[PDB]
Structures are given as C-alpha cells and as structure tokens.
Amino acid sequence: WTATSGSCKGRCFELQEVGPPDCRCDNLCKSYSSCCHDFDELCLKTARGWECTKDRCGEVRNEENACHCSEDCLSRGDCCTNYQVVCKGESHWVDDDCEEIKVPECPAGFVRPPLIIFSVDGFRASYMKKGSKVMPNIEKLRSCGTHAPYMRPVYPTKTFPNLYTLATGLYPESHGIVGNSMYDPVFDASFHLRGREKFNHRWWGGQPLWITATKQGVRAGTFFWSVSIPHERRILTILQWLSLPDNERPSVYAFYSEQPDFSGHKYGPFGPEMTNPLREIDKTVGQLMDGLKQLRLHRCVNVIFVGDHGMEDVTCDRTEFLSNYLTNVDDITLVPGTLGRIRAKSINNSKYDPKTIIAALTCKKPDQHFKPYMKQHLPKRLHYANNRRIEDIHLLVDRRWHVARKPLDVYKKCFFQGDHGFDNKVNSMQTVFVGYGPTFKYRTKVPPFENIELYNVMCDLLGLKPAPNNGTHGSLNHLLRTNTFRPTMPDEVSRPNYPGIMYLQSEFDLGCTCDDKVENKLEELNKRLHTKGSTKERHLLYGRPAVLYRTSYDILYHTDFESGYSEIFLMPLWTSYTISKQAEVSSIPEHLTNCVRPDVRVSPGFSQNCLAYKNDKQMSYGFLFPPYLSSSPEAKYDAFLVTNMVPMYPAFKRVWAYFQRVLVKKYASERNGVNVISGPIFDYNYDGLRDTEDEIKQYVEGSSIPVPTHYYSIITSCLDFTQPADKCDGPLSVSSFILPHRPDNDESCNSSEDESKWVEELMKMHTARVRDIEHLTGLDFYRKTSRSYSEILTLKTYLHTYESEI
Ligand SMILES: *[C@@H]1O[C@H](CO)[C@@H](O[C@@H]2O[C@H](CO)[C@@H](O[C@@H]3O[C@H](CO[C@H]4O[C@H](CO)[C@@H](O)[C@H](O[C@H]5O[C@H](CO)[C@@H](O)[C@H](O)[C@@H]5O[C@H]5O[C@H](CO)[C@@H](O)[C@H](O)[C@@H]5O)[C@@H]4O)[C@@H](O)[C@H](O[C@H]4O[C@H](CO)[C@@H](O)[C@H](O)[C@@H]4O[C@H]4O[C@H](CO)[C@@H](O)[C@H](O)[C@@H]4O)[C@@H]3O)[C@H](O)[C@H]2NC(C)=O)[C@H](O)[C@H]1NC(C)=O
Ligand SMILES: CN1C(=O)N(c2c(Cl)cccc2Cl)Cc2cnc(NC[C@H](O)c3ccccc3)nc21
Ligand SMILES: [Ca+2]
Ligand SMILES: [Cl-]
Ligand SMILES: [K+]
Ligand code: NA
Ligand SMILES: [Zn+2]
C-alpha cells in the first residue's frame, strides 16, 4: 500500500527516495504507482512547451510553465535550454567552433568535473557515419571528442544485460542479468521486462557505478527514468540538479533514450522512418549542450554518448521452429528469439534428456539458421555459462533470424522488422562510444573496445576505486588526457626450474618407442647450446610468460621452441616458437610416424606414457610444437619428446593438424613471420578461470594425465608488417583462439569435407583475447617488450573478429 496523500511540493525528482506509506516524488515513482497525488501537476509541467520565444524574453516568472525565460531563470537553474540563444544573443553550442578543452573550466565550488552518461538504446555503430547529416550535435561531439569506430556489446546483445554491464564492468554471467527474460531455479522466480519482480534487488549482482560512487562519498543522480517522463524533462531535471548547492549536487548523472531501438524494432535498422528518431536524439543532445553552455558547464562536464547494442533486419518469415525438429516439443520451455535457451518444462520429467535434444537439433537442415550448444561448449569469448540462470542448452541464432518453439508462438502473440540479441561479434550488433570533455582527449580516434572496459574509466573520471570487475584497468588509458590508471604488472608467483640432463633412457618404462638410434664436437657443442637456451631470443620474443599461481614447473629449451613444462599436469602450460616468412613446412618422416622420445631432463614420474594412449580407445595425442615446422631434420627429433605431447581426441587432431601444417605457415607468410604460444586449458566448471588439479573431470584412461577442455594459441607479429616478427621496432599485432577440445566435430556441419572447407570457420568462431587466455591459464604474457604497459593491456584485450569493415 501507498498512502499517496503527501505532496511533491518542492520535492520534484528528489534524489533520496522515501519509504512507503509516504508517497514518492523521485524519477521512478510512476513505475511503483507510488507518486504523490500532485506529482503530474508539479513535476511534469508542460505549459508553453520547451523553448523560449522572443515574446517570452524577460517575462514575469509563471511557475506553471514547463521551463522559463524570465531574467531570474539562470540563477534558479530552470531556463529553457535555448534561453540565452533567443533572449541574450548567444549562439547554439553546435554552431561554435570547437576548441580544445585542456583543463576543466568549472564554476567555483565544483570539486571534480561532473560525468553525464547519455545512453541510447539500439544505436548501431554505423549510424554515426550513415546518419551524420541529420545529427549535427552528435557529430560535433564525435569529431571534437574521443571516439571509437564502434564499441563491442556483451552477449546477449539485449538491453538489460548491456546497460548493467556498462554500469558494473561485469559479464552478464557475473552480474546475473543474463537476458531480458530469466528464470532463477534457486529463487524459483521469473524476471521479465514488464512487471515488478525485476525491481527485486536479488537479481542485480556486482556493484553498479551509482553504488560505487555513493559508497566513496560521491553523489549520484538517479539513472532510471519512467517512460512517461519526456526527454526534454529528463534534460531539464539534470540541468536543475547541476544547479544545486555544492553539498547536494551530484557528480554523476545518466540520461536514457528508448530511441532509436523503439523505432528500429518496427522499421528495421535503416527503415526510412529511422531518420526522424535520429534527428530527435540529436535535438535532445543539442538541448543538453545548450543547457550546459548557459550554466557555464560546457567545458567542465565530461559527457559520454554510449549505446547498449545495435539492431539487425529480422522478420517473422525468418523463423526456425523447434516443432520442425523435436517430436517432444511440449516437454520443453524455450526462451525464444535472437537466442535460444532450453530447459525441461517440468523437473518431475525423468525422461527429459538434454543429449537427445541436442542431437535432434544438430545439422538437420542444409541451411539451418541456429546451432545448438551445451552452454560450456559456447565460444569462450562469450563468457556465457557460469550462472544458474543460463540454461544448459543454448541456441546461437544466425544474424537476421529468430528461433521459436511452434508457429503459433509467432502468429498468435508481420509486426517487427528489426531485432538484436545475436553474437556480440556481429557487425550489426556493434554500438557507439564518444567521450567529450576536459578528461577525454581532443579530436582523437581510438580502436574499437568492449563495453566491459567502461566502468573502470567512469571510475577514473570520478576519482573512484572501481569494484572488482572484468575490465582490464589501464587498457583504455589512451582515451584519457589525465586521470590515467597506472597499474603494475602482476608478480610472478612460481619461479621455474631449469633442469639439465638427469635421467638415463633405461629409467623410462613408458611403452614409448622411436627409431632414433642413428648417430663430432662441431654439432654436439651446438646441440648442447640449444638445450641451454642459445636460440631462446628467437622463440621467446616477449619474455617468458609469468606463472601467477603456486605450482611446480620446468623451462625446457630447444632449437625450434621453448616450453614451460608442468610437473603437476604432466604437459606444457605454454610452448613458444617463431616461424619466419621464409620458414619451410616439412613432413613427419616415415620412420618417425609413431615416435615418442623420453626427455632425459624430466623424470619418468613426471612424464606422460604411451601405454595410456594405447589403452585409451577414445584418446589420441598431438604435439604443441608441430614437427612439421622443425628447422632441420636433426631438430625434428626434439618435437617428438614426451614433454611436447598432449592428449587429443582424433576428431580434434583433424583441427589441430590443419592449424599446425597449413595455417601457421599461411599466417607467417601473410604477417611477415609469426610468434606462436600454444598450450592446454582446463575449465571443467566453465567459470572462465584456470582449474586447480582437483577440478579435473577427465583423465587419459588409467593415468594421471588430465585432459584439456580447450587448446589455445596466441599469434603475434609486427603491426608494421614490413618488419619481420622477430625484428619489430614498434606496436604489435595479435590474433588468438581458444579451441574446444571435443571428441566429435558435430559443431561443424561440413566436417565430413576437407579441413580446408571447415577448420578456419571453426577457428574464427573461437577467436579470443589474450586476456581470456590469461584468466583460463593463470599466465601473464608480454612481460618483456619495449612497449608501454597500457599499450600492452590494450593489445591483451584485442579481439580479432573476422567481420568485414563496418
Ligand atoms: C569477472 O569479474 C568478477 C568480479 O571480480 C569475477 O567474479 C568473482 O569471482 C571470484 C572467484 O571465483 C568470486 O569469489 C568467490 O566469492 C564468494 C563470496 O561471494 C559473495 O560475495 C561477493 C562480494 O560481495 C559477491 O560479489 C558475490 O556475488 C555473487 O553471487 C551472487 C549469487 O548469490 C550474485 O548476486 C552475484 O551476481 C554474484 O554471482 C556470480 O558469482 C558467483 C560466485 O561467487 C557465481 O556462483 C554466480 O554464478 C555468478 O557468476 C557473493 O555474494 C566466496 O564464497 C568464494 O569462496 C569459495 O571458494 C574459494 C576458492 O578459492 C575458497 O577459498 C572459499 O573457502 C570458498 O569455498 C567454500 O565455498 C565453496 C562454494 O560454496 C565450497 O565448494 C567450498 O567447499 C568452501 O566451503 C569465492 O571467493 C567472486 O564472488 C566473483 N564476484 C562476482 C561479482 O561475480 C569473475 O571471476 C571474473 N570473470 C572472469 C572470466 O575473469
Ligand atoms: C533499459 N530501460 C528500459 O528498458 N525501460 C523500459 C521501457 Cl523503455 C519499457 C518497458 C519497461 C522498461 Cl523497464 C525504462 C528505462 C528507464 N531508465 C533507464 N535508464 C538506464 C540508465 O540510464 C542506465 C543504466 C545503466 C547504464 C547506463 C544508463 N533504462 C530503462
Ligand atoms: Ca575453471
Ligand atoms: Cl533474453
Ligand atoms: K588411443
Ligand atoms: Na560435423
Ligand atoms: Zn530492442
């Protein structure tokens, strides 16, 4: 109950909310049906509209007016935004030349430049160029401030997950808002866009920016705006808050616009009807900047213009129906649309089996427009698994398509022409970022970056210490004039051992064989030097990775490659090698086809054994440094060492072999040499973090050899490709992947064909940031370069998306 009997007099858009039965006057009261009786009359005034006119200039204050054109309005902080323009001969902000803002130019009493977040729903990245003619205020922000060509949203590219990621720096799996619709089995409760349950605090994890600010003594305007409050009123309210006295005035504010998303759904991303919503957003930005200029705040405030996600063309006729695949369709619940999530309709149904559902949905139709996954098999870059609110069965839907349970759901519930929600690497899902103000750089373009990074920057902008989050703090330092965050590299936790020759061949009873007993101080001094690390400068270009946890491991040197060998996991944590543009691919010679050699630096007790692979009918093995790329026939023997061997399903070997035999050379040829670091990943609990030994669910039969869930590679070269990878003077270029180590190739519908027709497509889908690999391995890469650490952090957050140009 709300006794709506109090008054909103002098309380309009109060910043501190009152607890019922006292009625509310805050910008959310409408949503709780809890506004005081006079809320509309006092707080949502509209009389005379939103602009001053020549005849209103110098008028006597009439409190009924929506905004004011009287002489007292400026000090009252409630002029119409165009007051000075109409009445005092000022120019609109958009008509002023831009001028570098080198320092905050704030009124006396401001302790820090305020931050205003101007968030626009569904604002696709390509609108900045394609709509430039009709958005002059936004274009001035973009060209004069710091801008990216686009900003990557999180998956799913829905509104609530992305806005909350913007506010927290967290992946949806960590903040808990994993969709616009959700069921939490622990609460036994549902979350929807419409309704009340979404207001319950138990849905919202992490620590959003307004809470971070409050806790550290920085006041925040309220971020949420009732849909019925018009945009002009939201702007005027922010401007009024900015005129509060020093002790009450917030330092952080957000505006939100439901456009252009609202019209995009109806008309498609580029419908002719889309021009007007873009013009209207621009006019709103103009109102804010004119209003800031009137208050002498236009060179004081940092403004961020940011979207949540883009918008794609999607129509009813592009719907796949699960009823065309499943006989048991009524035994499931589907969260439908641009992603699919499946669970059992009833938990008392013992016959329900996710394995058979997956199988009935796998590669059934020639041009099938969705692909089923167990959530832990989704591309790791999506970070979409470690939350009980994410169903075990997921469908990744092709851009432009929907999935639904049955046709009745689509025709009994074509209206829409646009939607969003798809894979966050999809170009149409990309959104915008512009930062403008004293703390941002002047006339600067920065590379595309992920929205998880912004929370750290907004904290930097407000002098706040960010709560723990998924951004990489410092990776966006290049956006900022000042207030940069200068992190130190993490300390190595475990130092390596450097074993020499300590074991005789006959101490090994591994069931391994090799035809190598075919034997000179010219080349024996030479090979000892290589085993001591004489070529390590060539193969370890950026220093050895640091191990950031407690473990026991050995560095192993070889002519063609260097590795950090784990005595706990019985395999390398990493293997590093450089392949020059000129390098030649050779074959595994016939006499070495099944060769595995004991490594006399590493005890039998810390080695794999060939017998376990022989006995394990499902499990085979591969090599981290590929024999195909050996520098010479003699160096090739090194690649067959038991310490270079890793467990691989035969199905996965098809992928790995094509990567090593064909793709590495191709990249070296295209990029003028590459350095590669490859290794295993163990993530059995799908939390995106390195497993401890006690978390491993699968071993090679009869052995303590743990089976990786994934294999990574990090492929680094010179950004200036006219310089060879091993002789690079400036910035680096990287692409990486985290390939799922799967016993079948069911994920690839064309895998019966030659690897040249399906492997690269699989690898593109499993593209990764180095930072993702760091989380998954507890390793820290690029420790020894000539580059600034912030630049290296930016490199580590880079994702090679393989999408064409926006
Ligand atoms: C991205 O960034 C984020 C933020 O840094 C990273 O997430 C963190 O990962 C940490 C390491 O796993 C994790 O640390 C754990 O914290 C537990 C206490 O957590 C509570 O308190 C914090 C602080 O206020 C709070 O943030 C948490 O909020 C979570 O939980 C609620 C759900 O009830 C949600 O509202 C919220 O959204 C968030 O959920 C997310 O995280 C949890 C895990 O905490 C997931 O399960 C959810 O699915 C969701 O993703 C909590 O309120 C603490 O209990 C843990 O300690 C256990 O394990 C350690 C192992 O080292 C051990 O030392 C302890 O003794 C303890 O073990 C005991 O409990 C075990 C489990 O019950 C049991 O098995 C044992 O036998 C023992 O009895 C642990 O320290 C941290 O909470 C999250 N933080 C957040 C915000 O998510 C994330 O890793 C980053 N991602 C990537 C890819 O890098
Ligand atoms: C997303 N969103 C909605 O979907 N709304 C809605 C609509 Cl339009 C129709 C039906 C039901 C609902 Cl709930 C109303 C709404 C109101 N205010 C906001 N503010 C977002 C805030 O500024 C912010 C938060 C995090 C980071 C940057 C900015 N977001 C809303
Ligand atoms: Ca893990
Ligand atoms: Cl959803
Ligand atoms: K085998
Ligand atoms: Na297949
Ligand atoms: Zn939408």
Side-chain angles (χ1 to χ4, degrees), residues 745-746 748-749 751:
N745 288 296
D746 286 358
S748 311
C749 295
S751 62

PDB file of all heavy atoms in Angstrom, residues 745-746 748-749 751, ligand 6:
ATOM      1  N   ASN A 745      33.291 -33.616 -34.214  1.00  0.00           N
ATOM      2  CA  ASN A 745      33.161 -32.332 -34.857  1.00  0.00           C
ATOM      3  C   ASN A 745      31.707 -31.966 -35.192  1.00  0.00           C
ATOM      4  O   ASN A 745      31.438 -31.363 -36.230  1.00  0.00           O
ATOM      5  CB  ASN A 745      34.080 -32.245 -36.084  1.00  0.00           C
ATOM      6  CG  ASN A 745      35.546 -32.122 -35.693  1.00  0.00           C
ATOM      7  OD1 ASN A 745      35.940 -31.135 -35.071  1.00  0.00           O
ATOM      8  ND2 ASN A 745      36.361 -33.124 -36.062  1.00  0.00           N
ATOM      9  N   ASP A 746      30.792 -32.313 -34.294  1.00  0.00           N
ATOM     10  CA  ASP A 746      29.367 -32.034 -34.502  1.00  0.00           C
ATOM     11  C   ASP A 746      29.065 -30.552 -34.656  1.00  0.00           C
ATOM     12  O   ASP A 746      28.174 -30.163 -35.420  1.00  0.00           O
ATOM     13  CB  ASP A 746      28.531 -32.636 -33.390  1.00  0.00           C
ATOM     14  CG  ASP A 746      28.415 -34.153 -33.504  1.00  0.00           C
ATOM     15  OD1 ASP A 746      28.952 -34.729 -34.475  1.00  0.00           O
ATOM     16  OD2 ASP A 746      27.786 -34.769 -32.617  1.00  0.00           O
ATOM     17  N   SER A 748      30.773 -28.502 -36.327  1.00  0.00           N
ATOM     18  CA  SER A 748      30.967 -28.133 -37.722  1.00  0.00           C
ATOM     19  C   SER A 748      30.147 -29.026 -38.679  1.00  0.00           C
ATOM     20  O   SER A 748      30.508 -30.192 -38.942  1.00  0.00           O
ATOM     21  CB  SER A 748      32.445 -28.226 -38.085  1.00  0.00           C
ATOM     22  OG  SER A 748      33.250 -27.556 -37.126  1.00  0.00           O
ATOM     23  N   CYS A 749      29.048 -28.483 -39.191  1.00  0.00           N
ATOM     24  CA  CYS A 749      28.147 -29.247 -40.060  1.00  0.00           C
ATOM     25  C   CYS A 749      28.784 -29.776 -41.346  1.00  0.00           C
ATOM     26  O   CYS A 749      28.322 -30.782 -41.864  1.00  0.00           O
ATOM     27  CB  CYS A 749      26.879 -28.453 -40.372  1.00  0.00           C
ATOM     28  SG  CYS A 749      25.843 -28.136 -38.919  1.00  0.00           S
ATOM     29  N   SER A 751      32.010 -30.901 -41.546  1.00  0.00           N
ATOM     30  CA  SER A 751      33.287 -31.550 -41.169  1.00  0.00           C
ATOM     31  C   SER A 751      33.627 -32.867 -41.884  1.00  0.00           C
ATOM     32  O   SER A 751      34.734 -33.374 -41.738  1.00  0.00           O
ATOM     33  CB  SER A 751      33.371 -31.785 -39.666  1.00  0.00           C
ATOM     34  OG  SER A 751      32.327 -32.660 -39.227  1.00  0.00           O
TER      35      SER A 751
HETATM   36 NA    NA B   6      30.245 -32.366 -38.243  1.00  0.00          NA
END
